[PDB]
Motif scaffolding. Structure first.
Motif, PDB file in Angstrom:
ATOM      1  N   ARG A 198       0.796  -1.228   0.000  1.00  0.00           N
ATOM      2  CA  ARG A 198       0.000   0.000   0.000  1.00  0.00           C
ATOM      3  C   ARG A 198       0.835   1.288   0.000  1.00  0.00           C
ATOM      4  N   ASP A 199       2.127   1.174  -0.304  1.00  0.00           N
ATOM      5  CA  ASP A 199       3.017   2.342  -0.365  1.00  0.00           C
ATOM      6  C   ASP A 199       3.097   2.926  -1.782  1.00  0.00           C
TER       7      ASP A 199
ATOM      8  N   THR B 230      12.700   6.109   2.177  1.00  0.00           N
ATOM      9  CA  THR B 230      13.840   5.550   1.443  1.00  0.00           C
ATOM     10  C   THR B 230      13.510   5.161  -0.002  1.00  0.00           C
ATOM     11  N   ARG B 231      12.616   5.913  -0.641  1.00  0.00           N
ATOM     12  CA  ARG B 231      12.274   5.678  -2.045  1.00  0.00           C
ATOM     13  C   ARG B 231      12.963   6.701  -2.940  1.00  0.00           C
ATOM     14  N   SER B 232      13.516   6.227  -4.053  1.00  0.00           N
ATOM     15  CA  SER B 232      14.072   7.095  -5.092  1.00  0.00           C
ATOM     16  C   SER B 232      13.365   6.780  -6.407  1.00  0.00           C
TER      17      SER B 232
ATOM     18  N   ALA C 232       2.934   8.724   7.060  1.00  0.00           N
ATOM     19  CA  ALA C 232       1.873   9.418   6.329  1.00  0.00           C
ATOM     20  C   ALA C 232       2.267   9.633   4.870  1.00  0.00           C
ATOM     21  N   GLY C 233       3.517  10.036   4.653  1.00  0.00           N
ATOM     22  CA  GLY C 233       4.059  10.191   3.307  1.00  0.00           C
ATOM     23  C   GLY C 233       4.199   8.864   2.586  1.00  0.00           C
ATOM     24  N   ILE C 234       4.781   7.879   3.266  1.00  0.00           N
ATOM     25  CA  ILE C 234       4.980   6.543   2.694  1.00  0.00           C
ATOM     26  C   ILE C 234       3.686   5.973   2.110  1.00  0.00           C
ATOM     27  N   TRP C 235       2.616   5.994   2.900  1.00  0.00           N
ATOM     28  CA  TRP C 235       1.350   5.377   2.505  1.00  0.00           C
ATOM     29  C   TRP C 235       0.572   6.228   1.499  1.00  0.00           C
ATOM     30  N   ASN C 236       0.394   7.509   1.819  1.00  0.00           N
ATOM     31  CA  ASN C 236      -0.504   8.390   1.058  1.00  0.00           C
ATOM     32  C   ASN C 236       0.136   9.089  -0.149  1.00  0.00           C
ATOM     33  N   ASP C 237       1.457   9.258  -0.127  1.00  0.00           N
ATOM     34  CA  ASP C 237       2.182   9.859  -1.248  1.00  0.00           C
ATOM     35  C   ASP C 237       2.848   8.780  -2.096  1.00  0.00           C
ATOM     36  N   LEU C 238       2.636   8.839  -3.410  1.00  0.00           N
ATOM     37  CA  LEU C 238       3.228   7.872  -4.341  1.00  0.00           C
ATOM     38  C   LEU C 238       4.720   8.123  -4.548  1.00  0.00           C
ATOM     39  N   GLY C 239       5.156   9.352  -4.284  1.00  0.00           N
ATOM     40  CA  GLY C 239       6.562   9.722  -4.406  1.00  0.00           C
ATOM     41  C   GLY C 239       7.404   9.284  -3.223  1.00  0.00           C
ATOM     42  N   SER C 240       6.772   8.643  -2.243  1.00  0.00           N
ATOM     43  CA  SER C 240       7.460   8.181  -1.045  1.00  0.00           C
ATOM     44  C   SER C 240       7.038   6.760  -0.717  1.00  0.00           C
ATOM     45  N   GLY C 241       7.953   5.993  -0.137  1.00  0.00           N
ATOM     46  CA  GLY C 241       7.659   4.610   0.204  1.00  0.00           C
ATOM     47  C   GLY C 241       8.779   3.886   0.920  1.00  0.00           C
TER      48      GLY C 241
HETATM   49 MG   LIG Z   1       3.369   5.887  -1.239  1.00  0.00          MG
END
Ligand SMILES: [Mg+2]
Ligand SMILES: *[C@@](C)(CO)[C@](*)(O)[C@H](Cc1ccccc1)NC(=O)[C@H](Cc1ccc(OC)cc1)NC(=O)[C@H](C)NC(=O)CN1CCOCC1
Ligand SMILES: *[C@@](C)(CO)[C@](*)(O)[C@H](Cc1ccccc1)NC(=O)[C@H](Cc1ccc(OC)cc1)NC(=O)[C@H](C)NC(=O)CN1CCOCC1
Ligand SMILES: *[C@@](C)(CO)[C@](*)(O)[C@H](Cc1ccccc1)NC(=O)[C@H](Cc1ccc(OC)cc1)NC(=O)[C@H](C)NC(=O)CN1CCOCC1
Ligand SMILES: *[C@@](C)(CO)[C@](*)(O)[C@H](Cc1ccccc1)NC(=O)[C@H](Cc1ccc(OC)cc1)NC(=O)[C@H](C)NC(=O)CN1CCOCC1
Ligand SMILES: [Mg+2]
Ligand SMILES: [Mg+2]
Lengths: 212, 196, 222, 204, 195, 222, 233, 195, 196
Positions: free
Chosen positions: C221-222, F18-20, F161-170
């Motif tokens: 779900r990320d 830690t997403r790029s 909150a960023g990890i789950w709800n933002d696609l640019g983060s994970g």
């Molecule tokens: Mg995300």
């Protein structure tokens, strides 16, 4: 695409590749680029896939309605002109079609007609159409004679597509062969480039540029 | 333009400057931006002169035809006709219109119609290029149920500032008083309002 | 200036077996970098054992599915409740899509079901009506990730028979419904890892002669 | 006129049990026209291997540049450069051309001679290091390679198994890309032996 | 400038280069030699932007000749091509790049082998059995893929080259006024006068 | 990216995902966005990945030389001043959006720097694509006089909150705690809530599946 | 082809155990100018549906009239207009969704984002979104504009999936909504303190709350913040 | 489409028209007849945008043939040219104009005089002793200014035409694959097979 | 931004909101837009944050170096340095700065420096996006030689309106009092000023 068809002593050869592209993405390797309009008429297609597919299938309907109304199979000239007049109505709208209407009738004999989306319609003995037409022309022109046998002509058509399939990045997949005679069109099988290339390289001794 | 309409105890008052500009040139320094669409329904016009003028003429035609069939229209009805024209032709119009009218039942009413074609009923309304400079002043100084003299002073002081700061506004301050008594036209010259 | 199109992301996948066919698609719906819904189905049962999905721009996708569903309905009225064959449905869809050739539906369409011989069938379309029957097709945002994996695992591409000196190819054979669902689940988990628009949930619609069955699986779900 | 997709090409690197693999296609074209089917994209400086995709003139230029730099490194340090150090050297060099970059997608691969640890790394054209345990992908069919690697890969593969996985990742990705293919090369790298295999793939 | 071809055979390298120099709607010259001798056993043909072509070719020629005098030694075709590539590789990131594509045909006297290099204006070098720049390749490559063999003689190579020129004369839109053919081998460079 | 910084009782804490990404593709699933400028001055970076790495190293290098020159432990304001003057000089072309934090002889500090060279001060800050998702959490739960354990919780919750709800983060959550009088503790992968599930199948190929043309030993030695 | 003039900002909403909540501030912005402060952007249709609308206000007022007219049209020749054949949220939504897509297809969109919140006749919660492009989607939490970026993250901590809906009470759900409205007031430059909130419960029915205000705001920490870096005074 | 020429002599009109049909970097056909017979003593050559050319030519042909049947009478070259001009004059202010330039060579049987009309796609008609469309004119007009005489025979006209084709083959950039020549006189229309 | 500086009997007072925006998102709701360039010479910053910040830092550096050599600089000198930077780099700057300072000889002084780089010495000055809405109010309400309490009320009411209408302005109202007594920082929260 790369499609060709040429007239010779023993009728007409028609050969096409089978690749579909969406930019540099290879959309398909197994697409049909020869439409069988009737037992005596073929239509090759290059350009926009849907445009080609839709309007050539439509052409087949118009050719059927002709022989119902006139109790006689449509001429290659008339069939090609139905299509060329159609695309001319859409000129400027952005249709992309490079077709070759190949067939035999009693009054005409073996005939090929090049028709494209900007309204050009040309009768001729040899045509190559598509992104890899130049590559096909190179091999076809340098080996073409009117007196080719049905066996040699079929191979030359196959070898010309293979040549283009190799060099042109937007052509490949497999070769679909056809032979049009006075008795109608005859299908001569699907030939995957994956096997055909190495088969040709070994037997013919060509493609020395490639690491064998 | 600087324009405004203000409701008060006895009815409503419309106010406007008199400057029409074609660029930095003043084409007309004595313009009448307060226009009658019906006996006691008037409007202030801002934006394109040609557009607001063409609209006001059509509204006047509709309300005249309304009166012939159904009697005197409400101020709300007038604003609805304005809206209908402004909204349906929003792509081809640059018109910011304030509609003000006096009913005997509803007393004074003010409807503002910005560029979009939306309708907003308010106690008072300000509009046009020069209105930006008096949002602060008008909000701090406006009161409901003012007298006629208080409302005239409120409009005069407001438009005076709007004129002072806005280059696109100036000339005389025209006003139109809408009450049960009738219709009264007022004018105020630079020599008076400038030194307020 | 007003832009009438948008990208709602996600990705879909169709695989055909011997006596069955599956059409899978993730349940995530997005715009830009925001998640709109974690569960918004885009694989639909359209009747007559035809499942359909039109991935890309959801508004155009829903519009198309809606029209095809309606096309099936009127096919019954006009032709004495005759069953719409998968090949006929495909051609009908081409005309729907090409009908808007000069203002297209921004969707990669895939339908699945059984042909008239009872064998599994997957048809796939471009945005303007071009179509082709295949054993295998991935569509949508992560199509470029999934499709080559399917070529390798479903059609056994680039796989040769061990010890035959790369001369004999690995023979083509149908896959079991169990093996197909494994490939689907691994395809979507792999696509979820590397594509930001893919995730949340996976919904598979399986089509056999018995009818249309559903299966749901969680995705990251990320 | 997109430098990254004129000539075409792909590189992929993977880690295994006490080994690394790096592979590349052989195509060099000018957009649709295929020109050369011998254009290798993997080079090596001692035991450190470097794959480079993207604009072919820069692929050549950078190889020559890193050969230059690693040679001087060896003369002054009196030892061969290690993959971790070389990775830093690549990043420095690329970022040095921040506002006029080499249009490339380099990939470092090799085994550290001291610790024996398998090492792989990728970069964007501007120098940003992408270190990875599992695999690195690069080129015009990077999306395809990501999809193939992410599904096919598993940890601790033996050299002979790793060869099959990386080869199948490259081949099936290359066949879905118009500007990649035309032959392929795979390097299998162990601690003190390196095997180089040319793959048979479809020539279209 | 338009058509430049190259074919490496067993014992020699053959370069064909079109004779037409066109500007606007006028063929200004139909006997133009689009090549320079860099050294006794190295020949470079060129095609591209007007002015740039000759200016670049002569600049390279001067540098190679300077090297030959300084060392009293001929540079290998590989070495010359690497030098040329680097010059173009510099050029492309200059204020005004040379827009010139070249073929370098040479005979390596140490290896006793003919060598053909194809370098574009970006500095993209490749060694080939046969090469071409511009639209020519779209016809000749597929033709040579079919008819070329690595063990051919110079005479066989010329017939193979005639087959290319005929195909180009048939299918190319523009009249390129035939070609000047030159052969590079162990005995140096010589021109085929009747083609 | 999603990055945050939170001030507490006796120091400051920063955190990051830690997403790029390159386009919609996840380039790196576990990259390090927390950067060490000096031992007790750390920096969270968002924007152009190479720019955040390069600018932080350059300033970090010059800070080290400055610390040796002055015989003093470096200050956060020195890093702040050097970063912002550098970024401003390049007029935003160096796309680095930083959260600078640390402890020094003056005390504990928390700043943010934008690519164009503007700096802000705060008790809680967030930058990156998922800064709105993070800031929503920070605005809801932040209070004055936070403890160390409360600040780490708030910080990691804002990153989630960023990890789950933002696609640019994970992927994962990195944390770095900088307390006064103590060593800064860098908590790499403090949370790992996005572990990949077991694959349905092993795709280990039978040896000899791939066709080979040539083999050769490569010489790496002298 | 339009451009929005007078605009309304975020509309936020969520499901809870017995129904749905929806909220939207009372501001009609004119670019950066906070022009109109008495604008109601929640519009009830019957006693079982509330339509929340953001974007262009002139287009919102058009949609108001369409809904107002829809209630009238439904009542015609309909003895069960206030019973079995009353307007459902799903009917009201699909109508708007049809209109929105038809308008975008004619390149003349209603420049809005709409959330139709309500409760169906069988007790099921209805919550679905539609915008100027005709894009539709449903979720336990829905929000427009800045709400999508800031509210949804907070509301999803309460109801993260379907199974969390029965576990969420109206007290918990309303508290989350009111909190979200405060966060939006802190951070959305085109938002106002005053707002309206609506609760559609399957038991207690429609509860429409007007003239609410954002309260319990944290501003005290501002006094300590000096300068932008190296300032002490 | 590119080269179309016309030369009116004493007793006939001679039309030359290039045979090449090119598209992109490929000459698709080298035997194309860019003309239609409008009536027994009227011939129209054409050049311009692909598709438009033939579509227009055949449309005119159909109309003139319809007139001939209706009245059992051949329209004069002047009358046909006026009809053609009007069609192009309408065309130019249409949604999509015909981009076609034409030459109308005809023999007037009532006047016993050959006539050559040049009409461009705008509907600009002119009667000339010699005419050309496209870049051809830039060479042929000056050449004909010098060598043309009004009292020449058909054989002299063909030699004059050969002189034009030679000049074009020498100086034109594009290969137009020679020309098809046709003669219009009192006995009707006939084609010169060996040119 | 909404910012202003006002001279009065005992000296001068600077005033500002606390809202920093990146589009419609509020990046910082507690910004300190009042910045010290010298002991009793401060400035209000509007326009580009990065630009005004970089300028203010350079000015602070110059005035520190001025003080080391020539003693305390005048408020005019400070404004001159600001001008020099803003004017000479007008093509690359978006900075609207109000300079305010207290000398013992010259008492309170206010210099405003708009986008162009021109200098204007005034009794009071207003600037930033939200200032447009209070030209009317500030002109009507300003008086010379006000008291400290009157000037604080004048700034508070003004910035309250500017904040109310301008979306780009908001948060707290910071103020800085410059007199012979020293330097005093004031703050005012929404719950107070909103309901004025
Ligand atoms: Mg995300
Ligand atoms: C070769 C491969 C050149 O690409 C052939 O021309 C091939 C012919 C062909 C014929 C029948 C069925 C399939 C393929 N053409 C394509 O594959 C074609 C290439 C092409 C794409 C876009 C074009 O713009 C008008 C023209 C040619 N590919 C497609 O049509 C692909 C599958 N579809 C799209 O890109 C969808 N687009 C088409 C244009 O309208 C918008 C949507
Ligand atoms: C003030 C000046 C600015 O808002 C007022 O709105 C004023 C209103 C007014 C004027 C006269 C009578 C009634 C009401 N408007 C003008 O003076 C107006 C300014 C304006 C022009 C064009 C606009 O966009 C279409 C917007 C505002 N002046 C005019 O219309 C003058 C007479 N004409 C022109 O400037 C020529 N225009 C015509 C429209 O297209 C642009 C060129
Ligand atoms: C999130 C993931 C944004 O999506 C973060 O901001 C992240 C920050 C980060 C990542 C790794 C290490 C430290 C910090 N940003 C990225 O991963 C970044 C996203 C991005 C791409 C392009 C942009 O436009 C300029 C802005 C942001 N990705 C990259 O920098 C990747 C590795 N490289 C590229 O996309 C190629 N460069 C080429 C030169 O121009 C910039 C993009
Ligand atoms: C109000 C908001 C608008 O005038 C104030 O002027 C305010 C002043 C301020 C803010 C913080 C600290 C001190 C003073 N200005 C801003 O908040 C400013 C708005 C603005 C940005 C760019 C401009 O043109 C260059 C003009 C005004 N906000 C910012 O600078 C923010 C931090 N950054 C951005 O919006 C990114 N910009 C950078 C500059 O280029 C355009 C993108
Ligand atoms: Mg190919
Ligand atoms: Mg004035």
């Amino acid at each position: 695409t790369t499609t060709l068809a040429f007239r010779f002593q023993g009728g007409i050869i028609v050969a096409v590749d089978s690749r579909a592209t969406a930019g540099n993405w290879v959309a398909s390797q197994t697409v049909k680029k020869v439409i069988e309009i009737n037992p005596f008429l073929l239509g090759t297609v290059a350009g926009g896939a849907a445009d080609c597919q839709f309007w050539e299938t439509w052409l087949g309907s118009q050719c059927r309605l002709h022989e119902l109304r006139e109790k006689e199979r449509i001429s290659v000239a008339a069939a090609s002109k139905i299509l060329s007049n159609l695309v001319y109505q859409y000129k400027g709208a952005g249709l992309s079609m490079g077709t070759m209407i190949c067939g035999y009738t009693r009054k005409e004999g073996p005939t090929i007609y090049y028709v494209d989306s900007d309204g050009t319609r040309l009768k001729g003995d040899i045509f190559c159409v598509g992104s890899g037409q130049t590559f096909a022309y190179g091999v076809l022109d340098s080996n073409y004679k009117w007196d080719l046998s049905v066996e040699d002509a079929l191979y030359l058509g196959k070898r010309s597509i293979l040549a283009a399939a190799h060099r042109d990045a937007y052509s490949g997949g497999s070769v679909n062969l056809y032979h049009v005679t006075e008795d109608g069109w005859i299908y001569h099988g699907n030939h995957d480039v994956g096997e055909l290339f190495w088969k040709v390289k070994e037997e013919e001794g060509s493609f020395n540029n490639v690491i064998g | 333009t600087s324009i405004m309409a203000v409701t008060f105890k006895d009815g409503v008052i419309l106010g406007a400057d008199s400057r029409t500009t074609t660029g930095a040139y003043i084409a007309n320094r004595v313009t009448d931006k307060l226009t009658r669409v019906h006996d006691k329904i008037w409007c202030c016009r801002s934006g394109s002169a040609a557009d607001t003028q063409a609209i006001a003429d059509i509204v006047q035609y509709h309300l005249e035809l309304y009166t012939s069939q159904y009697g005197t229209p409400s101020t709300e009805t007038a604003a609805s006709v304005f809206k209908e024209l402004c909204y349906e032709n929003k792509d081809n119009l640059t018109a910011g219109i304030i509609v003000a009218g006096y009913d005997d039942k509803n007393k004074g009413e003010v409807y503002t119609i910005p560029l979009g074609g939306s309708v907003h009923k308010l106690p008072y309304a300000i509009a046009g290029s020069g209105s930006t400079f008096i949002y602060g002043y008008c909000d701090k100084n406006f009161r409901e149920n003012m007298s006629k003299e208080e409302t005239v002073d409120f409009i005069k002081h407001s438009l005076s500032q709007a004129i002072k700061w806005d280059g696109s506004s100036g000339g005389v301050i025209r006003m139109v008083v809408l009450t049960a008594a009738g219709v009264e036209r007022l004018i105020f010259y630079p020599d008076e309002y400038e030194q307020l | 200036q007003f832009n009438p199109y948008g990208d709602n992301g996600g990705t879909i996948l169709g695989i055909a077996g011997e006596d069955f066919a599956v059409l899978a698609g993730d349940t995530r719906n997005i715009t830009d970098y925001s998640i709109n819904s974690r569960y918004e189905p885009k694989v639909f049962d359209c009747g007559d054992n035809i499942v359909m999905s039109a991935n890309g721009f959801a508004a155009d996708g829903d519009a198309l599915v809606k029209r095809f569903k309606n096309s099936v309905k009127w096919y019954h009225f006009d032709h004495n409740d005759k069953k719409l064959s998968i090949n006929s449905a495909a051609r009908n869809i081409q005309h729907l899509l090409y009908g808007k050739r000069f203002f297209p539906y921004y969707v990669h369409t895939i339908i699945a079901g059984l042909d008239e011989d009872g064998k599994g069938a997957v048809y796939s379309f471009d945005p303007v009506g071009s179509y082709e029957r295949e054993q295998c097709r991935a569509g949508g945002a992560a199509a470029s990730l999934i499709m080559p994996f399917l070529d390798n695992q479903v059609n056994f591409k680039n796989q040769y028979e061990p010890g035959t000196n790369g001369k004999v190819k690995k023979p083509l054979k149908y896959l079991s419904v169990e093996e197909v669902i494994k490939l689907v689940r691994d395809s979507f988990t792999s696509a979820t890892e590397r594509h930001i628009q893919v995730g949340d949930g996976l919904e598979i619609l399986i089509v056999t002669k018995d009818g249309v069955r559903k299966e749901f699986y969680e995705l990251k779900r990320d | 006129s997109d430098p990254s997709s004129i000539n075409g090409g792909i590189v992929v690197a993977m880690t295994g049990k006490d080994c690394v693999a790096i592979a590349c296609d052989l195509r060099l074209g000018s957009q649709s026209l295929g020109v050369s089917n011998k254009f290798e994209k993997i080079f090596h400086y001692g035991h450190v291997f470097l794959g480079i995709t993207g604009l072919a003139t820069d692929v050549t230029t950078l190889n020559e540049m890193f050969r230059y730099k690693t040679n001087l490194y060896k003369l002054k340090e009196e030892r061969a450069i290690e993959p971790e150090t070389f990775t830093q050297l690549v990043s420095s060099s690329l970022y040095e051309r921040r506002f006029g970059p080499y249009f490339v997608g380099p990939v470092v691969a090799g085994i550290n001679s001291k610790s024996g640890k398998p090492f792989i790394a990728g970069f964007d054209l501007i120098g940003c290091i992408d270190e990875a345990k599992d695999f690195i992908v690069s080129g015009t069919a990077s999306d395809q390679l990501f999809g193939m690697c992410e599904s096919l890969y598993e940890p601790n593969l033996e050299p002979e198994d790793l060869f099959e996985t990386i080869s199948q990742a490259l081949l099936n990705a290359a066949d879905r890309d118009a500007l990649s293919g035309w032959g392929a090369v795979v390097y299998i790298i162990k601690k003190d032996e390196v095997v180089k295999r040319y793959l048979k793939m479809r020539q279209d | 400038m338009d058509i430049i071809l190259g074919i490496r055979v067993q014992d020699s390298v053959i370069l064909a280069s079109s004779k037409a120099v066109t500007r606007g709607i006028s063929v200004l010259k139909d006997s133009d030699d689009k090549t320079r001798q860099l050294s006794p056993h190295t020949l470079m043909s060129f095609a591209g932007e007007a002015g740039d072509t000759v200016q670049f070719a002569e600049y390279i020629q001067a540098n190679i000749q300077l090297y030959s005098i300084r060392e009293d030694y001929e540079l290998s075709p590989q070495a010359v091509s690497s030098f040329v590539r680097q010059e173009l590789a510099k050029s492309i990131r200059s204020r005004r790049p040379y827009q010139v594509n070249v073929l370098i045909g040479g005979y390596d006297k140490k290896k006793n082998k003919p060598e053909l290099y194809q370098i574009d204006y970006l500095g993209t070098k490749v060694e080939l059995p046969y090469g071409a720049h511009g639209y020519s390749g779209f016809y000749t490559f597929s033709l040579l893929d079919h008819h070329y063999r690595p063990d051919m003689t110079t005479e066989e190579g010329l017939d193979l080259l005639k087959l290319c020129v005929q195909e180009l004369e048939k299918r190319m839109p523009m009249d390129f006024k035939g070609v000047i053919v030159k052969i590079v081998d162990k005995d140096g460079i010589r021109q085929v006068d009747d083609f | 990216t999603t990055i945050v910084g939170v001030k507490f009782n006796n120091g400051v804490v920063i955190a990051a995902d830690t997403r790029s990404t390159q386009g919609p593709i996840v380039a790196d699933k576990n990259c390090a966005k927390l950067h060490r400028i000096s031992p007790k001055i750390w920096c969270a970076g968002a924007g152009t990945a190479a720019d955040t790495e390069a600018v932080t190293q350059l300033i970090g290098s010059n800070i080290e030389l400055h610390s040796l020159y002055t015989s003093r432990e470096p200050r956060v304001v020195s890093a702040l001043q050097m970063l912002k003057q550098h970024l401003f000089k390049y007029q935003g072309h160096i796309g680095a959006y930083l959260i600078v934090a640390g402890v020094d002889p003056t005390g504990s500090h928390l700043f943010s720097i934008h690519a164009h060279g503007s700096t802000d001060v705060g008790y809680y800050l967030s930058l990156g694509s998922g800064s709105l998702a993070a800031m929503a959490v920070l605005e809801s739960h932040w209070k004055q006089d936070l403890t160390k354990e409360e600040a780490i919780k708030l910080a990691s919750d804002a990153i989630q909150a960023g990890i789950w709800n933002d696609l640019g983060s994970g992927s994962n959550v990195d944390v770095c705690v900088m307390e006064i009088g103590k060593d800064a503790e860098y908590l790499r992968n403090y949370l790992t809530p996005n572990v990949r599930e077991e694959k349905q199948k092993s795709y280990k190929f039978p040896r000899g599946t791939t066709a080979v043309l040539k083999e050769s030993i490569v010489n790496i030695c002298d | 082809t339009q451009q929005p003039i007078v605009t309304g900002t975020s509309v936020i909403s969520m499901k809870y155990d017995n129904g749905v909540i929806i909220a939207a501030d009372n501001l009609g912005s004119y670019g950066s100018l906070l022009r109109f402060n008495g604008v109601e952007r929640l519009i009830p249709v019957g006693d079982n549906t509330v339509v929340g609308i953001s974007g262009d206000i002139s287009d919102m007022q058009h949609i108001e009239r369409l809904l107002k007219d829809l209630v009238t049209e439904n009542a015609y020749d309909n003895p069960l207009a206030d019973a079995e054949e009353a307007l459902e949220p799903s009917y009201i939504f699909e109508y708007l969704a049809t209109v929105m897509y038809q308008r975008r297809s004619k390149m003349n969109p209603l420049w809005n984002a709409i959330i139709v919140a309500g409760v169906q006749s069988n007790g099921d919660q209805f919550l679905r979104y539609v915008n100027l492009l005709g894009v539709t989607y449903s979720s336990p939490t829905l929000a427009t504009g800045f709400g999508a970026h800031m509210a949804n993250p907070l509301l999803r901590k309460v109801v993260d999936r379907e199974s969390d809906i029965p576990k969420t009470t109206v007290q918990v759900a309303e508290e989350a909504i009111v909190n979200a409205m405060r966060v939006l007031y802190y951070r959305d430059a085109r938002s106002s303190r005053n707002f309206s909130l609506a609760i559609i419960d399957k038991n207690t029915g429609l509860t429409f709350k007007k003239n609410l205000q954002v309260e319990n705001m944290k501003w005290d920490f501002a006094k300590d913040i000096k300068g932008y870096g190296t300032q002490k005074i």
